[PDB]
Structure 1
Amino acid sequence: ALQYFYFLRNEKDNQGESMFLRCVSELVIESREFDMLLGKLEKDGSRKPGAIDKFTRDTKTIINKVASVAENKGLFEEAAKLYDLAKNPDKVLELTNKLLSPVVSQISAPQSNRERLKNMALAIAERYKSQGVSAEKSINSTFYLLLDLITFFDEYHAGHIDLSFDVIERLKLVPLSQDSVEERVAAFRNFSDEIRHNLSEILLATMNILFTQYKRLKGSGPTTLGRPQRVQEDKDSVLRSQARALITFAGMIPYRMSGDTNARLVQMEVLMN
């Protein structure tokens, strides 16, 4: 079919668009034979040429038009691979951040969109690390922060409360002390929208972690003859101080959280007092 459309190489429509470009764009989308027609990226990020590279030197304009038609049809994974083939790392991580953002806090289910998008992002991350490919520092920092947040929510949903706490402490996204609140509110202004959209769920998960550690401390009845009572009172005071820092932070951020989120944060603190 591509041999026949090459006769249209000099033909233009009434708008001046190339008829060859149009027919090839329809052909690639209908056949779904992207790697064969348009070529594929290797692990080094060299492009293996497709069938179309025989006919034109401007394969990049073709791949971008096909990618835009795939995006408009809702084929976002294929559109991301095609924009990447259009030699755009920056675009890969930008689109992957947009795709990961709504699924970060979700519970992992077998065959879920979250698990598929996570596995896609991990495969991109492993390959870009092995090839030494870096996008723009802003986009790249957002991408790895979304991956670390997926790990935080995996450990949280697995019930590994102490490991999920160590991850959120390392990420420095939320204040774990009253003194850190102003610094973190200032830092919040520099986060991307993809991270800001997840902040309500991060605060709820972090507050649930603190509340569950507090319940474990109170439910450990007095039957271990040998732990000094002062170390328990000090740890209770610290968890309540951390919980207060999260609420003070949630109230100071220039971001309108859901009314249910703020109500649940305050309700968990009242149950810790």
Structure 2
Amino acid sequence: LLMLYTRKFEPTDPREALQYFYFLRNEKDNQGESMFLRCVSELVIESREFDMLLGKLEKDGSRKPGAIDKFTRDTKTIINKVASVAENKGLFEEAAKLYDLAKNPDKVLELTNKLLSPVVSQISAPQSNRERLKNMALAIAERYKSQGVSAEKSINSTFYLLLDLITFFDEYHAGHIDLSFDVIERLKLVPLSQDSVEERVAAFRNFSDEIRHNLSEILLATMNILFTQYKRLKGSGPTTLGRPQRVQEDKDSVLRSQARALITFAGMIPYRMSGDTNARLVQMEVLMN
């Protein structure tokens, strides 16, 4: 009877349905959870409206009170459980926003990693859902920077690393090869000499499986830029567009050291990657030397 009568006005304004739910506080299941909890979760899913129910952050500050806050207590637990059911239904962005309301950055940062890692792996096109996810993630990052909100430092550093990675790929896709270059050496993941390979090894075990996957694309763009540099220098002789031959030769020698170190590390990584990636690594590096 109750649930059918709720059906009579499910899409009505929120708090109205809330007093209906309020009667269901006394009711629950001895086989698990409460009908109250399940219904509030499902209906707020249908709602996608929160600033009145749980309240809202002014921008990111204190949570302004919600409607249920007046008649109910300890609403952060409801926040967490509801966003848990949301992500169980795959409602990732809204669950993340709800934990932003909850002040629980851990799952927020984890999930934004799983969100950005695929979209980061595509080209930089204006008005893209890649850009949407980028924007929400950078908003999260800026909020936590301003707030001093600190997760496990491993995840924090990896996330700042990722953000710098998007900066890199944006430069690459815009064709600002020099800017992307500067970005990568300040990212200091550039093994110019063979001695940086074991440093890259040390960096590797710091990584989770997902970024371990994405290192392949990272090094792909890397060798792309490297080969462009070497070929452009080779095409620039001393009688064409300047760039004297001695400087080009010395820089190409340094670059060849870098490329051979890159291939050595690519071979001596500890977990298996794509054989296509391996072959392409080797064949652009032969083009390099």
Q: What TM-score does the superposition give when structure 2 sets the normalisation length?
A: 0.88
Tell me by how many angstroms 1:29 deviates.
0.6
Correspondences of 1:39-78 after superposition (within 5 Å): 39-78=55-94
Structure 1 pair 200–16 and aligned structure 2 pair: CA distance change class (3 A):
closer
Offset at residue 92 of structure 1 (A): 1.7
Structure 2 residue 269 is the aligned partner of structure 1 residue 253: yes
Q: Would the alpha carbon gap of residues 89 and 225 (structure 1) be closer, same or farther in structure 2, given more than 3 Å must change?
A: closer
Q: 1:139 to 1:227 in 2, by over 3 A?
A: closer
CA contact under 8 A between 1:217 and 1:232: conserved in structure 2?
Answer: yes
Q: Secondary structure at the match of 1:227?
A: coil
Give the superposition deviation at 1:16.
4.4
- Return closer, same or farther for 1:28/1:225 CA change in 2, 3 Å cut-off: closer
Instruction: Show structure 1 runs of 5+ residues with no match.
Output: none
Which residue does 1:144 correspond to in 2?
Answer: 160
1:174 and 1:52 map into 2 onto residues whose CA distance is 54
Return 150-159 or 18-27, whichever deviates more.
Answer: 18-27
Partner Cα separation in structure 2 for residue 144 and residue 42 of structure 1: 26
Q: CA deviation at 1:59?
A: 0.8
Distance 2:99 2:163 in 1: 21
Given that residues 12 and 19 in structure 1 are in contact (C-alpha distance below 8 angstroms), is that contact kept between their aligned partners in structure 2? Answer: yes
Equivalent residue, structure 1, for 2:19: 3
2:229 to 197, 204, 213: 213
Residue 166 of structure 1 corresponds to which residue in structure 2? 182
8 Å CA contact 2:227, 2:288 repeated in 1 = yes
Cα gap change, 1:48 to 1:211, in 2 (>3 Å): same
Deviation at 1:164, TM superposition (A): 1.0
Asked if structure 2 preserves the Cα contact closer than 8 Å seen for 1:96 and 1:121, the reply is yes
Query: Residue 228 of structure 1: CA displacement?
Result: 4.7
- Structure 1 stretch 79-88 or stretch 198-207: which is displaced more? 79-88
Q: Measured at CA, do residues 99 and 175 of structure 1 come closer, stay the same or move farther in structure 2, by a change above 3 Å?
A: same
In 1, distance between residues paired with 2:271 and 2:70? 52
Aligned-residue offset at 1:174: 4.3
Contact 2:237 2:245 in 1 (8 A): no
- Note the alpha carbon deviations across 1:140-191, whole angstroms, 9 max, x for none: 1111111111111111111111111111111123422211111211221112
How many pairs were matched up? 273
How has the CA–CA distance of structure 1 residues 18 and 172 changed in structure 2, closer, same or farther, with 3 Å as cutoff?
Answer: same
C-alpha distance in 2 between matches for 1:89 and 1:250: 34
| Structure 2: stretches of 5+ with no match in the other structure | 1-16
Secondary structure of 1:47 counterpart: coil
Flag the structure with more relative contact order, 1 or 2, with Cα contacts below 8 A and sequence separation at least 6. Answer: 1
CA contact (8 A) 1:104 1:198 kept: no
Structure 1 Cα separation of the partners of residues 284 and 131 of structure 2: 30
Residues 43 and 140 (structure 1), Cα distance of their counterparts in 2 relative to 1, 3 Å cut: farther
Over the matched positions of the two proteins, sequence identity in percent amounts to 100
User: Could you tell which deviates more after superposition, 149-158 or 58-67?
Assistant: 58-67
Give distance in 1, aligned partners of 2:242 and 2:35.
83
The 3 A distance-change label for structure 1 pair 11 and 183 is same
